[PDB]
């Protein structure tokens, strides 16, 4: 027909329909077939999407994730659904059940972590619950009573075990932990990953998404899977990873998210009278990781750089992660204006060929840009949501509104795509992606 | 908080969330616990609610119902879910699998029928599909190819087997077939039902809805269950029911719905080039049942009367079924103006104590009125939807709009109640009622 | 930027801002500069646009128009604003104040008429007023008390003086009376208009709209002005016009509007207890003009034809006026289905190059089609509104809704254009056109 | 009827209709009859309401106000419409044209000032203009070119002449300059104002608002008018006012607005490349007045106090002005949490009897509270708007959203009242108040 777009009520209805369709009972899959398990930072965004629909079920999603938390406080990036195949690497390949002393009992999980967006989801649940009356507030408050300690142990694990030199940046041992699997950010670190005798495997992801231009290459997957072998060889021991891992990077976007999450969780702790020692620690980490992000920044543009710990070199790339300081604050006034100018100008949101005024995952003017290839170019609704929410929290009400308006216009086809081609708007990756529906529901719920 | 109501997008999202939550896979329950099976006219309204969400799944709902159609064309009023308890009378009590020569193989069903709203759901599916493009139109058109014959056999069974004297009104052998179980319409016919040796039973419905003021009495249930015994004794044989049934009424509201449904299905048959003989028969029945409804009407107010076939007497009651002629048309101009005056005045929608400008199931000024008791007074969103849709089809655009606006205001608490107290707006009956969510979604989808 | 469209709330605000900006006090101009006076059928649409904003001011608009009614009941098509120039032909050219015995005192008007959409405006005012409470209902009821007789005299002058032979169609003496000045409908009748010594003149309309492709030609204006000379020569006397006018046509679209308007006014008359004889006359005229419209129609396609009274021949053209019978009803069932098939097919709303699913003023496949030239092709929001309102009144709820949706999409640029290029959507004619803002306000009010 | 509320589109339409109706040509009256002139801070809010409708007309509103700026930079609080009477005190009473050396030529104005919300209006105009494309941006940029210097002179006159001692707070010589004429804030200072021989007068305000409970008392008006006599006696000379005025107070709410406005104007200055010295002065003033506001605050609760310069004492009252520090920032973290707890608790937004979750002008638990009496208790939409905008700018997105939602709920009756009874929601003061329509338009525009 003359316009395939849905009205706001039709789109909200379809988004909620999707999220309930991806519910296995106590966990929501990240997508129906491509990602048929619970991913950690996806579960946070799913809980945000569920909060306008059912505070009780949003709380269940976070409870299920936190029940898979490791003994040392790490939240693993995948919690596998029982008896579910069609995703590789599955639990057999990770072997955390047999090898990892800290793995949970009676959950199957991966052995790496992912960004700490969870406190943001807790804030959204509390904000919805407070509009819904007493029994709903009681549900959310009982969740805090039950899980405050687990959330603290999660933030403490990050601060103590992935920032062992108190530099205020999080070290990753796998690009998957960044959430941006094949970002140009990691190319030079991955070039220093040399697989040994890698056990044979067959990919599953590109059986579902068959267009090779939309997913990482076989050579990249070989490196992803080899890092798993290096972790397995030391039984996922935190104390041994710095000595054996071929990939060790400080992720400045993860670090900025953690700064925000600490500040958010500290404000929740004050509001709900959690222990003062915990609130103090959270504000201290918020400050430390804010400073750690600012320390990376370009002196002209304010752009944030990742750091290769093995090579001891700043990683300079032109991706959306450069805008990490906008999330957590801390740049001097003049440099933050330069960074906003970069965000809005012809290298990113202002590029003249963009269909929507949204942030591409890699700058279209970078030689690394590929308009279809996962994190090397496409526009991701999940990132649009996170930037809009963080911008509103900075006080940039109009910038946040414009991102939401363009993100809703992009989503109004109802495909709920994982990511979109930046110039044509073609939906790419998995359709029926839960956190894309969640973004739409929060923007409308 | 200061206002518990939801915005239109929040309400649409919650309605879709509910309908997906009630999906068992290929059938949607009418409610989560009170009605944990598929009801026939509920399934039509569920398909209307699904159409803005998934034309494919809306079609599946009707396919599942039609797969339970009896050999003689009857659509039974319940299709039981496999292995589901907590509803009485269940399939053991009906014993149609063992006793009824016309019962379907490999579905379990009841042995009575319910109103033919199904063609209306087919129209809504086609209207949505035509806005959605080629592959979606193909899905809806393939449904017509597959099920046109079954829909014809359903309408033919009603016309030939429940109007055996071609009076243009449908005979019922159970008040449950009217959809209005305990309506005052049936009280005098039920007083002539005398149970014999009624096999012991324990109700299940009032274990879920425990407030006795909201459900029928034990004495009424004894009569409902005795009629089942009379049908079982003749093995549900259509030819034997007139000779043995203690309850035989002509239902003028069912008759008007059938008139509309025949006209709707005839227009679909013309549009999609179905056999001309079928379209002709449908228009003939549309006309016959329109005239049959008009024949019942009060010469002053236009109000339609049911007919007790055993007592040979017009049943004069003050319920929403009086407005049957407004659905199908056919009254002379002056009498239809009088009937609209009755609808809008102080006996119904204009009653000064009503919270919303909606049609109570029984007039608040009738001595039969009970403000909590199922069909004896409460406002039913399903009836608001049906009247609004039929009124729009009469060309009464503003009257239809006002019913929709008030029905949405009533529903904006998000309880999706089965029915509502007419004066206080208190939600009553089952919460999470699928056809209440469907009404909201159609009004917004 | 990326999306120059307005939200529904922004668009409704800017539509109301425009209408109040075109208010001279007691009359609203049809456009700020091109049409700086009150046009008769524009005033009806303006009152519809004002009814959601102020029932009182909506009533004032019709009061002002009726205060300019001629002594014989004719509503003239222009009521000039005092002292305003820049429109031609102005009141000096018409000279009705000096020549026309029936012209109003102390108003200046044109000497021809225009379609009777006024009763539709009265219906919308009453519907709004009934939602606004006792004081607002009193305003609208006082208007009926004060103006019912003038409305009757208007309808009676059309029925008796423009249908002298009781054929059930309205005769026009000028194409301006049709509202479709340069429609292909009138080309063969204008070809027989041979101007004599025409007093010199300078056009004003193409000083404001300078693009010559958007307005009638100079040769066309010469014929328009020559017909004025013929009417002036007989002092605008109804009895003498049939003997002298070079242009005499029966307008089937005007006739169908009149049928609808008579039926609408009759129902208002019944509801507000107006004299029985008036109501009976209105129903008589509604039927007469419904039959008159049907008599013009092609027996296979249903398309309605105009009639050239001087040439005694049916005018066969491919414009939107062919769909006149859809407005008033009366066609046999098969013929109306055929006419709907024409409307929805590739000659009109289904043409593959149309930007919107809307009714072009002339079929894009006609040899007469010109995509920019006034009534020879462009899409007119005022027609979209009239068709969608009449369709909803026929019971065609989905058809009406689709026209409304597409009309709002087209209007969402906020130009409030007089008409739009059918392929590109370019706004054409005057911007800030009052009845385009009124359509938008009604569709959202 | 059952729901006298308007839909968002109807409400936006009626708000725009009202604003255009209050337009005299180049100035908008604050209300049709009670306030038939241009008020200074009302004009800022009016320009905000016009920006979604016409950036050009929004700019004209500020141009007209600035054309009335005094020679020393003061923006007077009233610009009188030519020839308009029915407001008292009018221009003959002020006699600024004859007495005040700095009064404008060929404009008539008052002789006192009002809060500097103008920069906020400029920000909203620019944000709208940037969404509307090149021509509209040029309009708004031309305004900056033409008026940047006048805006600087306005801020510099406040900073240098109303903060002579560089305390970072604005001194007022009349309670009218606060915008909160009869606030309890000023009661102890007015108690020391002893009128001498006051030239006789007749109030006009209580001929329009006759209910005495809604307006200030006669004794209060005598003091207001006596202060005028004191200013006239010294010819409105800035240098002489501190020696003669019986009323001299530092207004912490005005001061916080000024801080915000300086920061807003500085950011505009940086974005549009205005002189570096101006931007540096604006940042200096923003900090000075932020610190000045913080210096007034209770160390436990954060509540800000006004200061009586003549009595040399802090004015401790329980009004909405206590929340001044929330607008401008600067409080220590613990103190701001305490102040938010006061705002949200049972003394203000959390009071159990409030109809809406909105900020009453005086705490309902204060002995000074009067639920109908102007600034002594009622809820003012203009304050709701200002607080919600400032809160969003602080990053408090949910707090801002809740105020907007409740303000729209309250405004959904369409009265556009000046203020509302806090318990019953009764509209009070003038109906058709321009800045109430502006708030609604901004919240929906």
Numbering used by the authors:
A (entry chain A), B (entry chain A), C (entry chain B), D (entry chain B): 2 to 446
From the paper:
A glucosylglycerate hydrolase (GgH) identified in M. hassiacum and found to be highly conserved among rapidly growing mycobacteria is likely to be responsible for the rapid mobilization of GG accumulated during nitrogen starvation by hydrolysing it to glucose and glycerate. The MhGgH monomer displays an (α/α)6-barrel domain typical of glycoside hydrolase family 63 (GH63), to which MhGgH belongs. The crystallographic structure of MhGgH revealed a homotetrameric architecture, which is compatible with the oligomeric organization of the enzyme in solution as assessed by SAXS.
To avoid substrate hydrolysis during crystallization or soaking, three catalytically inactive variants of MhGgH were produced. Two putative catalytic residues (Asp182 and Glu419) and one substrate-interacting residue (Asp43) were identified and replaced by alanine to produce the D43A, D182A and E419A variants. The thermal stability of the D182A and E419A variants was comparable to that of wild-type MhGgH, while that of the D43A variant was slightly lowered (3°C) [Fig. 2(d)]. There is residual electron density compatible with presence of the substrates in the structures of the D182A and E419A variants, but not in that of the D43A variant, independent of the soaking time, highlighting the contribution of Asp43 to substrate binding.
